Amino acid sequence: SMNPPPPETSNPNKPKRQTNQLQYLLRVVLKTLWKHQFAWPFQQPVDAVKLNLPDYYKIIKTPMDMGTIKKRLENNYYWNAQECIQDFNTMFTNCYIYNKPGDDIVLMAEALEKLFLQKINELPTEE
């Protein structure tokens, strides 16, 4: 089967704003996770075709990845910081759903999620 289209990253009909929290999510949170040694499998939508995973998009109906999250932030797609946080959580939980406890890719996600939670603990108060 084909890959689904990637999640929307721009919508000219969605209102836009800049907040210090969204700036932090891009400049601090995303940036720190992106450079992590275990980040690479989470940097783009899963290409189930190239990876030969016929069941991936049978199981994962709400795909999400850091490339999509980054594009959303660069485009001012998010209105609330919580939208972005929800997207990271969806990414992590999709990993845990598709795979099994103890799998290498799960350990990788766990490492990234721990770091994510550390950075979110330092989220500045909404100005």
**Which of 51, 97, 107, 117: binder of ligand 1M3 (CB under 6 A)?**
51
Using DSSP, state whether 25 is helix, strand or coil: helix
Q: Is 98 in the site for ligand 1M3 (CB under 6 A)?
A: yes
- Phi then psi for residue 72, to 5 deg, are -55, -45
Q: Is 95 in the site for ligand 1M3 (CB under 6 A)?
A: yes
Handedness of CA 53, 96, 87, 38 (dihedral sign): negative
The site for ligand 1M3, by CB under 6 A, has a size of 10
Q: Is 105 in the site for ligand 1M3 (CB under 6 A)?
A: yes
Q: What residues contact residue 77 under an 8 Å CB cut-off, 6+ apart?
A: 8, 9, 10, 11, 14, 16, 71
Q: Is 92 in the site for ligand 1M3 (CB under 6 A)?
A: no
What is d(CA 109, CA 99) in angstroms, rounded to the nearest whole number? 11
**Which of 7, 29, 42, 72: binder of ligand 1M3 (CB under 6 A)?**
42
| Residues engaged in binding ligand 1M3 (CB under 6 A) | 41-42, 46, 51, 53, 95, 98-99, 104-105
